[PDB]
Amino acid sequence: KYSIGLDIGTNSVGWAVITDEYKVPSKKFKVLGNTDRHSIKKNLIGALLFDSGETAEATRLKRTARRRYTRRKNRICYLQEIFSNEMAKVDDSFFHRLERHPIFGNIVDEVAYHEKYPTIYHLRKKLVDSTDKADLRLIYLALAHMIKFRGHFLIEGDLNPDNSDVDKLFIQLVQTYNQLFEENPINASGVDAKAILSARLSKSRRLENLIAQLPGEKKNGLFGNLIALSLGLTPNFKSNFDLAEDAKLQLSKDTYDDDLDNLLAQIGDQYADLFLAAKNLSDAILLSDILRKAPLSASMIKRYDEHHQDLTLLKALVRQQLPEKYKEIFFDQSKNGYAGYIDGGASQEEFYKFIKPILEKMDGTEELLVKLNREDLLRKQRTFDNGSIPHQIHLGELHAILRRQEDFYPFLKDNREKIEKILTFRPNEKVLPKHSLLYEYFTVYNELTKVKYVTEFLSGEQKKAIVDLLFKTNRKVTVKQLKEDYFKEISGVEDRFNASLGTYHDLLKIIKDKDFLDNEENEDILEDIVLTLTLFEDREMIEERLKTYAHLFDDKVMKQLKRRRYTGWGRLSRKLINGIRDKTILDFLKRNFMQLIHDDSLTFKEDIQKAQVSDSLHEHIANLAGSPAIKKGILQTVKVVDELVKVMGRHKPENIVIEMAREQKNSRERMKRIEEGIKELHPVENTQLQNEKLYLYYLQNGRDMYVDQELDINVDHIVPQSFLKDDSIDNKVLTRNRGKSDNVPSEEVVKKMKNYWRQLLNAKLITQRKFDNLTKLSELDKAGFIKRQLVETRQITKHVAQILDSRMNTKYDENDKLIREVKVITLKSKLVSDFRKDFQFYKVREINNYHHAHDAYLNAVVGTALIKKYPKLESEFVYGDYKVYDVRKMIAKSEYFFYSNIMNFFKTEITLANGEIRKRPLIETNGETGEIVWDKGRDFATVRKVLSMPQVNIVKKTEVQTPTVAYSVLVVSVKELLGITIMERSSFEKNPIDFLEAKGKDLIIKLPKYSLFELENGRKRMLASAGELQKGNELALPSKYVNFLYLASHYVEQHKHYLDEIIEQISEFSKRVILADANLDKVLSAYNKHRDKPIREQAENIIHLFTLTNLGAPAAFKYFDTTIDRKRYTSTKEVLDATLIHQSITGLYETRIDLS
Ligand SMILES: [Mn+2]
Ligand SMILES: [Mn+2]
Ligand SMILES: [Mn+2]
Ligand SMILES: [Mn+2]
Ligand SMILES: [Mn+2]
Ligand SMILES: [Mn+2]
Ligand SMILES: [Mn+2]
């Protein structure tokens, strides 16, 4: 029925809905406001603007240690639930004992464990290699350590040799780097990156060595800093980006993800894939190192043994030669020697700096110095040199330990896939001891609550009396005792009560103090004591744990307390009984407990039902690599997608197309390229290098590339546009038809020109790829083109597609296969850009915010059309598993496509490099399915119509900040606005009336920042603060004026009057809503001042004029010589009688509150 299109950005989210013929649906929507407007017609197209500020959503989008903690805790809980039954057979208190602290209940097993397994890696490797059966607790320890620290998931596939190949990942880094800097690419050529990066040398040495292979590159340069990031160093990127503040990065550092996110928040998100590439390179180095069973655990054990023999050798040497320094080196934590390195606060750099002179003066052994220079002397267990480990390694050890032990333990074999899934997949607390006093109290009370005793149902005072007079006095209470106690016909009980306060009496006989037990304040202590008695079967451990309470009790009482031990575990958590409140469950018992849980009137049911689930989307987004703004944008795209789903009657869209790309320095890059290219072999300043013909002029040294004739200062694709769209300078060349000849790359007769191309090649004036293209079209090259135009390299967009895919596809079929109702397409920006260019759908950012919505619409159009035309290519640009079709087969001989440009089907006729024209059918359609995909006479008209329509839903998102006001509540003696600071807001929420009375009732209206209000002739205003207003209006322009402005600014002279018409429209708009006449007079006057100026500059300054009409906060803007100062709306009084418009995130659902 329909599909959604989206433009995703750091401060906006364009969205559009589209039918099979690319129409945008119109739909009525209810208006909930008191105003007499009961419905509204709206197009399903629009945009959501939003601030990057301090909101609850913002903090929800940040990483926190607590969330990671609860995450790992949940995974371990899932692990323990599988192990719990057999673990009860082995060690009932084992899982409770876990967080030096004792893993085991007795000293013997504990010391034996620590002696046999000094590090967890010893246990891991032993469990991987040994064929012998092992204790279930040990296997749990290894699996738990692996699941707890699973590592990253950057490599989607099963681990393969290309993943550990340092050379290929180096080429990847150079490639993603080159994409960001087309002007000065780094040439990997034949550089032996593997031998250099994996060499047994200091990281700084490997850096200098690798950079030595790359001419024109300094160590401080961005690529060199990335290589230093890969090697394990700590580069500072502030110099590379001219940052105001330090931007050091170290992959090994725990904060590196957040730090990288800060750097992205400064330099922009385009660089994120580059850093991800550097991290992948570091992973290749470490992986190749551990690869050359359980290689990771084996490498860790190797580091351990090496550390220890190096340590004993160094000790023997220091004993033999420098005895005076021995205590200082091995025992002084304050000093930078080994003691300060292991247990003091000394960095490996400080430590090596300390021992370097000492090892040299020693002359006892130089090999330790060799290990030191290579930084392998005394490595700690708690480090990995710049990197988090890929999960596949831990997974391999997981399969190894499970497969090895599954025979002895059948449940491991049965739950194997589940255990792996716990590591791979992307109430809260443990039960009381069975003999805890709180538990015994809960049992006796829960049984006691239901006792009939009807005479010619038990009172709570009667319950407390029965417990105090019977359950406390007697170790067990027979029913005849209950009857005789009633004396001093019953029902709900048998011959004797089965529940009893046995722990109360056991402790009573030992403590010999009833009041200490009866007192409620001491209960946490007694709980900890009984928990200690259950936790350990060993007296020394019980004594050690009980020592904390030793002041409270007699020595003899402690010695007696050590003997008692309990062996059971209860079925309920302590806080289910006494933590949750209404009034705790135990308070209610003192109605059945089960009935108590199931009463809707009481809060326990809601609190538990929430507790089972007790955010995951904000958390998943938080861990992505990006700026806070782009993440907030992802959140907004998700919410917008959900609302668009609701608007369409809960029917899922057939498709969702998504686009995420960024929307002076380059002139400096080009300047460097021209300067170097000229120095290797009519001066003009850099700002005009932006011009393509001029920059191509200087790149070619004032010479034609095809004809060998110098060109006077006062353009052709090397590989023709029909084969692929590459407007980049790499494919462009300035020329006099002369050299191009036919459709094939520039003619072999013109390839005799190639020596000049070679002189341009060694000058860096042209890239090697451009040389290879000039010197040439193979069918494989066509396959490369078709593969290139479709695939989207950006990683964050892949994560967005994955998120949207998970949100859109939940149902599974009987075969347990996923039911994919929805495709999530990911377009390259270039396709939509060139689509705007070839078919004259011009964009101008400054006229309005409409361009976001228009972009989303074009995204859905080009995307859905691209799927409909080439279903076989679905794997390349749709999320999910799909067959990767043999690309050569769809490529054809001259009789899918012979010309490799995938966008070609939109065109009615294609112009070849020779000028010959290939006509195409008016209606494009898929041959395999027979489905129509495009109608050139109708669909283009529908596109122009969609762009042309004035009504578009622009929504500036309202927000509540978290001397700063969160929101401004309207107050009614008289109407007025009042700010509410975050400090005030809590007490405000608690007792608002007394607060308002403190300041000096039926209507509570909190107004979030950017709240919308309407008044008079279509005018709108936003509440930036109680003291100021922003412009709420979006000036729409007819498409003729827009295309005219684009064409004039990018310089039909006959259409000169359109300047005056546009200025008339801006003035009518400014008078209708902007209300800044004093500035408008200056603007019109200045427009009269420079009518003499050429139409290009006139149109550019008219383009500057639009900031006056722009939605949002007013800003100063220069029009020719004149500058126009911003006009603030500092009076918010007019808003008080204005009609408030509460907007839906799409803006389709309005509620209009008018009070006046
Ligand atoms: Mn975009
Ligand atoms: Mn008991
Ligand atoms: Mn000249
Ligand atoms: Mn946009
Ligand atoms: Mn432009
Ligand atoms: Mn300008
Ligand atoms: Mn002037």
Curated annotation (Swiss-Prot):
Changing residue 659 to A: Only cleaves 1 DNA strand, probably the noncomplementary strand. Processes guide RNAs correctly. In vivo, loss of Cas9-mediated CRISPR interference in plasmid transformation. This is CRISPR-associated endonuclease Cas9/Csn1. Residues 959-1156 are annotated as: PAM-interacting domain (PI). Residues 794-962 are annotated as: RuvC-III. It comes from Streptococcus pyogenes serotype M1. Residues 53-70 are annotated as: ARM. CRISPR (clustered regularly interspaced short palindromic repeat) is an adaptive immune system that provides protection against mobile genetic elements (viruses, transposable elements and conjugative plasmids). CRISPR clusters contain spacers, sequences complementary to antecedent mobile elements, and target invading nucleic acids. CRISPR clusters are transcribed and processed into CRISPR RNA (crRNA). In type II CRISPR systems correct processing of pre-crRNA requires a trans-encoded small RNA (tracrRNA), endogenous ribonuclease 3 (rnc) and this protein. Changing residue 67 to A: No DNA cleavage.
